[PDB]
Each structure stands twice: as structure tokens, then as C-alpha cells.
């Protein structure tokens, strides 16, 4: 988190704009003898904040190769962006670098979004930013059991619905080489963004990997560490020179420790299950997985008493077979699921059946959510959430209620027993904080609430419009923590949530342009001092506005461009059309009703800025509203089809 | 139990009661005052004393009836100026009403047998050891839902009458609503008078009408009287000392939901069930989370002396109703389900999705299997109960293709063996029932622990076809097996355990005739009839069975034997009409069905009734569930 990341092999400076780093290309810094005298200094003196991209043939000769491995063994990160001599130079990229990422090419823009969403999560892992935490409540983990994911490459977004992770059964591939499994991980990252469970399941535990190949099993699990998977999967019956070899150089990849009862005769009260749990605590495993086989329904209730007595480490525990479906329904962390377009052998339920049986035994209640506001017929929130409840087979409904005061929505909507949450689109955003007991940090500094879920001791309240603007920039190329400044054209509306969104993306000074300074200074006194709200009022400042790259137009686009507001906005886009530090400088407009607004035309072909429309704010604030209401991540391919078509 | 039954009432069920117990009968002012005394003490042990209708007209003559009550007698009323003198001088009542259909006649004379098995005290219904359910009839008046009450009680092994929510809680109304359930449902009645502190509409401040309501449950002969546990202790010790043979369920409910299933209040309520000697103890909580269900299965395994109906409530306690074994409350679409109880489809659908059941496959095996009508019977019962099973056919001639294609598979559920393979499947049953040894054929092979169980349900189809047409289960008549066909040995065995003192074989030809006596025990007395003069000594024959095929119209030596046997029919009067049962399915008009009905006035029964009742006990053996009878009868008769 402190040192540098040597990149060997357009993605290099995007990594620089994530941690606040700056690129140092060694091609411009400048045959094989002067390449060794350069590798001495900058690999040690520029060991603070530089993403030291190298040339092509740096690995020629033993001069820098023993220098790269000296820094790779001293805690440093040598990273390889695999593109696609290449049979002779790539074989020194693979033995020098300790971390590998496959930057495969993307045609559609949804694949190019996933590869920057899976490279934030990759860099958050190998650097030490955030280890992949165990999910809080109920989570799933889809068991991708296809021998070639390119046969099911189109429907991968429909497979990973409800899943918090994917379970890459490595032994079930065509060939378990070093190169085929590294190419299948690039498919669940250009078509998904979930963490990967790297299961190499031996033949003594129910898979297709031979037990005598210990050296080919050590190499496979050491490769998954290099590719930055989030959950490596050792077995508790593995030899000690392979449990200790993996757990001494995992770095940050969490270890699930597994032992399945494939014969199916140990009930869940033996000392055989206390030892294998205690082997997982002794090897410092983040999750212990213990799989049984049910011969009756008592072994599912025998498992509910085993998990009570053993809560030291997180435990996955379920009973395989047709008589162990209850233990798969009642299991919290990483319940394995399957799909109809995948091969299925262990009879795991789908997400439509895991959520139906959890409703038929009373885990989900038939809750009712509402959206409130005075012009509520022109809304697309019941279109968005109901198509998310249908995809996950949740027993929820989302309806409308026209309201003007917050006293009526207490009686007709909130005081019901089946009430599950609200969503607010009115000046009721200011007056529904009367009900919120616990407010987030977003709701107090903005002074608006568009989500009202019930919790213990009252009700929770959060503004997700700052997610609705920050997420819309991240899905259009912007790093989540860049180093540019901001802009907000116009005040009023969702402008108080635009200023809170831009600072949390890492903007230094936020420049506000609007036709009335009386409502411009109101945003100045109502916000903290780390935000640096500098109103622009003269045209000389709009030339010297520093590093403006993320504008958010909150202006009502029924009145066109005022002119007295416009001569700065034509000038703001002038001096920043060439700075592209990790991202092309982009713009967002926070209203939905016209499909293209006056400001968006004037900035996309006249000044070369990327425009994101208002419907991409309705999804991303409805994505985060889906997570607070239900607890699941919404299917993005269906909430984006329901809000548009 | 060997004592008399003094039948009181107005001016059929008296001598049918005599024919059931094997007990004799004696029909019974100043000349009546002397003669009514000695027939109560020297005709005490044995005669069901049918007394008159004006016997209660006297003052002292009502007292000699009440002398029989407190000593331990079974004085009994069969149902305006004397109803206040009939219903007080009887420690058990019973209600006979006018019935329209033969199915309506059937349920009255079937729910009388389990009534008279209860109030005499022979075989009480002992707390069903499988996985039972109970329909919660929540209707104010059961004549509204009366056309569908056979569809309401489907898959339920008991009926939960909630007496509080009747529109009238009077003694005449509850005895009318029990009258309209024994006409359509031959099920045990759980008599629940629920008070307002536990979720009911009966008040708590009127204790006197609550005690006198549970006493109507003892006297109308219901099976389970509910007593509450937060009740007055004079009521608990009155419906546990005067309960008779009606069992006691003790309930406590948490209407608030302030107790979890680790509090000592649930332990004290189980010990109130153990100390009051209740048969089943009942504990209904309320689930505010799904953990409250798994806190219940750790209570159920720490408290196992008396059986426990333990289940939470609310929409978060559906696991506690699904995982419950004894008497899960179920409801219907046509009933006012207010505590959101499951239906019979939703209880089995949820038990399958959590792994209680498995998708099994049952088969019927035999060589001419193209027209069997056995898969149509069972598939009409899996559909009504929503069990996840299928029934199919497998043409077989040898028994080894059954073992390697059907039996050894992990989805094997059972077999229903037909004619050319019944003898061969006996080698697979590691536990044969007593009927399988005596008959010599097995038509049911269900898997058990370490092998398979082999039963012959052909005798219980020949038997239950008679009991469904008015013949008592233990009457005193004699029988006749006409033929020596494929079902001939089950019909000999079914005739003895019906209670015939004598079975008379009469065959087409005498080749396969004397072998039946060397292959049957001497206790099952089989007198072979030889000549026509021997038809005159054949006495009390009113339970005949024909299994001669309907290819030959009856003539020769055989016709003259049967022609003088059915002539001694209705005049013997063993409490029923003389009955013949044709064993062949397809020839609906058998010539022997004509010559016993259109000439000698017997009640003849076609072979569609035997094919159903053979499959009804196979359905109980294959699934553990009582089959819906109208749905499986209206699957063969098409």
C-alpha cells in the first residue's frame, strides 16, 4: 500500500489514477547494458508513488531479472498485463512477476465496464486495500461447472443472478493447465464482476482431479493466488507441505478449507467433524467448509446444532443429496447454487428455488414497499424493483402512493405490519427525516432522504442519490478515487447530492455556476470545509478553474441555456478537453424527462466530453435502493431494461 | 367391555350393534316394571338390551337407568317431550340422521364402529405414529360447506372442530355439527372449545358453559377432548377423571409472543401435561424469526415422555408446521383460514422442497398389463395430496427383470404385483406378513430397513368391499367361495377374519378343490360341499364370494349347489342383508351377479369395488397416507 507497482508487459496509468500514483515510463526515460544501469535507481529511488511501466524486452538477460525477483521477494509487486517472440518473451513475464492480470480485448461496452470493475477489485486485493470480506447476511455462490465457459459466454449475466461469488471448479475444465484456467478467469471478469472461489476438487472428495498429482495441484492453487482470486480452496485432507505452502504465500487471498463426506455415514456429532473444524482454525483459514450427505431430515437439524457450537471461524455447512435441501436453504454464508444452462450433478437449487423455499418456510416475509411523491404517475421505480423481485423470485411488491404530507404515509404505508421500505421523490425528502431514527452520514450533510427502511428501534434513512451519481461515473471510465476537481452546473434539485457525490470521488475544489448567487452561497454555508466550494462569478476564473473533469448538470432543462450562466460553461470545457488522467473527462445530467438536454449537446461534440444521461442516475440510485430494501444486489441487465423499455 | 349396552330412544342400529360385538339382543307399564329388573342383572353379561321408548315415562323407572351409569355401564341414546329424559339418562349419546346417498349411509355406519370401539373401550386410536395432519374446520355452520367436506378432509387424519366459533354454542347445535361430519368424514374429532385468552371466541368469565361443553365431547364419543392448561383446576380434574376413553390433548398458546423456546414456562407446561396424565401435549408458540423454529426442535428432543404437538405461528413459523410430526394443523380454501394454516398441497410441497420426501417411482408388474387401472388409481391420489410420486407399468414375466430394472434403483418406492408374478415375488420379502404366508401370494413389496416388506392386500379388498356395503367387521354368519380361481385363497382368508364360523367351497370342477384344505389350517374350517342335499345343511350363508370367471354361464352340478344356497338368504337375519362379491372387474353383469340379485334378492357388489379397496391399502402402504376415496373411485370407474 506504500511501495510501487512495477508493471511489465492504456491500463497502466488507469492504475496510477486509482491510488494517487503517477506513471513513469522507462521508454521515455531512455542496448541491454544501459537497460541494467537504469533498473538500479528507479526500482529503488522511485519506490514511493510511481507505476513503473517497463519496456517490452526488459527481461532479456540476467541483469534485471534477478533485480526484479529481488524486489518481488522483498514485498514489492511486479504486475503483468497479459495482452493475448511471444512464445519466448512471455515465459519470462510469467516467472518474474508475482501477480498476473489478463487484459483481454472488449468489443461491447458492458465488457469494458466489467474489466474496470474487476480491476478495481483486483488492485484492492494485491495491494492490501481491502481483503474480500465474508458477506453479512444471506449470500449465494454459483457453481460454474462448465468445461468451457465460452459455450455459455453469452448468458453469464443471467447465470450470476443472486450470486455473491462464482465457484470456479478448476478440475472440471477441459485441461487444467496453467494457461487454460487463466483464460477462463478472464471470461468471468469480462462478463461478471463477482469474487471467484478457486476450487480444485480432488477425486477423493467428489471431483475429477487425481490425488497423486500433488505437484500439479500446488502449481494450480499457486496460480490462482497470482491471478488475484478472492477465495482459494484448500482441502483439509491435503498434505502438510501443501496446506502450509499455500498458506505461507497466499498474501491476501482468503482460504476456504473443505472436507466433504462423500460416503455419507458420519453424522454431525462425531469427533470427525470437530477435528476438521479444528484443522481449519489451526491453519488460519478464513472460512471452514464442511459438507455432509443427508440420509434423513434429522441430519439437517443435526447441522443446525453443530453451527451453534462452532462460531470461532465462519462456517459453510450443508448436507448433499435430495434429503439435504433444508440445510442448503437455511445456510447463511455462500450457499452454492446452479443454473439451467450449466451442468448440475450435486442437485443445488437455483436462485428461484432457494428464495421460494426460504419463503415457504418463513425466512422472507411478504413485504410491501412504496414510492411516494406528488407527480408519482411519471415514475419508473415500480418498473425497476418489481423486475428485480421477479428475477430473484423474492415475494415483494413495489407500488405507488401519491402523497403531499408525511403524516398520511405513516398511516396508510408505514404503520402496516408488512411494510418494508419507502422511496421518496418530492420535497418530502426534507420532511421524511422526521421518522428516521438512525441517519447515515450521507443524509445529514445533504439534508435529503430517498430511502426509509425499518430497523430495530425505529427506521433507517439514507440518501442514495450520491451513489446514483458516483456509480454513474465509475461505470463510464472514471476511477473511484481520482485526483481531478469537479463542477456542478446549476443549483437546486439534486444539487446538494451532486456536491456530496463529487467530493467522495476525490475532487479537490468543486466549482458552482448558476444564474443567481443568492442560491449559490446557500450551498456554501450548508456544507463542510473540506469540500472547498468556490463559486464562479467572472469569466477570468473559468479560465483559471483548475483540473475540472467531472461536471454534473442539475439545472432544470426546460429553460434553455441562460447565457449569463453559459459563457463560463463554454469556457470550463475549453481548458480541460486534453487532460485524460485515467478517464476521458465526462459530464452527467441529473434529470430524466428529455432524453438529450441543452447542455449535453454543447459539451459532447463541441468540446469532446462524455455525456451520461439521466436514466443512468435512476438505475444506480435504484440499484443501491434495491440493496438496502432487500439485501441482494439487483440484476443490472433487467433493471436497466425495465427502466428504459 | 363384556357388559351390556342399554339402548334408549325412539322407535335397526340395535341388532347391528348386537351383530358387531358378537353379543345377543333382547328387545324390551306395571308389567314392564317387574320384568325390566332381572334382565339387567342375569341378562347383564351379554345381551344388548334394546329398551322401549316410553321407559323414561316413570320417575323411578328413570332411576334404574341411572343406577347402571355410575357402576360402569354403557347406557346409550340413539336419536321432543322425552329428550329431556333421554339425554340425561345416558353416559354416551349418538345421533342417527336421514341419509341420502350410499356413501352417506357408509360414513354413519363406519363412524359408529369407531365410536363403539371407543365407548366400549377395545381399541382406542393410538396417536398416529406416522406423520399425521388435522383439518381445522373454522366454519360457523358446517351445512354451508357440506357438499365439499369430503374434499376438505383430504390427507387429514383427524378433524379439529373449533366449538367456540360456531354460530350457536348450544348443546343442540354442536350435536348437529357433529352429526353433519360423521355423515361425510370417518375421522377422529378433536373437540376444541378455545377461550378468548388463547385466541378464541368463547369467553373466560363463563366457566360453567365451558365445562359442560367438553362434557358433550365425552358423551358424543369424540376422540380427542382439548383441555387448556391455564384453565380452572376443577375443570382439569373433571375432564381427566370423567374422560372415559376420549383422550385428552393439553394446549398452551402464546398469543403475545413473549416466550422463546428456552424459557422455563414451556417446561412447566409440559410438566402440567405429564402430571395431569394427558395423552398428547400441545404447545403453540409464535415465531418472530426463523431461529424460533430451530429452537423448537431442540425443545422437542428434550421432552419426549408424552407426545408433543409443537409448532410456532405467524408467517415465520411455517418450518415448525412442516417439520411437525403429530397433528400438524391444516386448512382449506373453502374454510375461514385466519391463523394462516397451510393446505394439504402446500404442506407436502414444502416437505418435498426441504427434503422430507423423495421423488420415488412405483410400478405395477405383470404380463397382461395393458389394461390395469392401477396407475390411474394411485396417480389420482398423489395429485390430490401433492406427493412427488409417479405410478407406471412394467411388463414382466420373470422376477429377475424386476430386480435389475425397478427394485435396485435408488428411486424405487414399491410394487403392486399382478397375477402371473405373485408367487415369484415372495422370495424377495425378508419380512412377510401373516397374510402373505397363509395365502401364498404377495401383491405389495415396499422397501424397509434391510430388505423389503411383503404384504397381501387382496384380503383387505375382499373384506373392505363387504364392510363398505353394510356387513359388520365381526359378524356371525357363514360364507361361500364359489370357484377356485386366482383370488380364491385370499377370499378364504378374508372370510375368516371377517368372522364367518364356516366357509363352504363350491367349485366348477373338483380337481383343484381338495388341495385348498391341505394348504389351509384346520382352524379356518373349510367344509367342501359335494351333493345337492348338502346344500340344505349349509347354514347361515350370507357372505358369499364369486370368483368363477364370466365365460361360462352357470349350469351343471355347480348351479344347483348355489341355487339352494342363496335361497337361505335374508331370513337368517344376522344384522345385515346377504352379500355376494364378484371378483372379476370387467364383466359388470356377471350371470352369478344376476342369479343372486334378480332372483334371490341379495346385495351384489361388482369387482370395481375390489380393485379400489385393494389399491386403498396399497396406497396406505406405499405412501403412508390415507387415499382420497372419491378421487380414486372416480379414476377406475371411467
Numbering used by the authors:
A (entry chain B): 857 to 865, 873 to 893, 913 to 966, 990 to 1550
B (entry chain A): 866 to 876, 882 to 898, 923 to 973, 1001 to 1559
The authors write:
In the human fungal pathogen Candida albicans, ARO1 encodes an essential multi-enzyme that catalyses consecutive steps in the shikimate pathway for biosynthesis of chorismate, a precursor to folate and the aromatic amino acids. In Fungi and Apicomplexa, the second to the sixth steps of the shikimate pathway are supported by five enzymatic domains combined in a single protein known as Aro1 or AroM. Aro1 forms a flexible dimer allowing relative autonomy of enzymatic function of the individual domains. Our activity and in cellulo data suggest that only four of Aro1’s enzymatic domains are functional and essential for viability of C. albicans, whereas the 3-dehydroquinate dehydratase (DHQase) domain is inactive because of active site substitutions.
We performed local refinement on the dimer of the Aro1SK-DHQase-DHSD region, as well as the dimer of Aro1DHQS and Aro1EPSPS domains that resulted in molecular maps of resolutions of 3.16 Å for Aro1SK-DHQase-DHSD and 3.43 Å for Aro1DHQS-EPSPS. In this map, we performed only a rigid body fit of two high-resolution models for Aro1DHQS-EPSPS and Aro1SK-DHQase-DHSD domains. These two models (Aro1DHQS-EPSPS and Aro1SK-DHQase-DHSD) were obtained by docking and refining against cryo-EM maps X-ray crystallographic models described earlier. Within these particles, there was further structural heterogeneity, due to the Aro1SK-DHQase-DHSD fragment tilting in various conformations relative to the Aro1DHQS domain. There are additional contacts between the Aro1DHQase domains in the Aro1 dimer that may also contribute to dimerization. The Aro1DHQS domain, Aro1EPSPS subdomain II, and Aro1SK-DHQase-DHSD backbones show nearly identical conformation within the core structure of each region with minor differences seen in some loop regions.
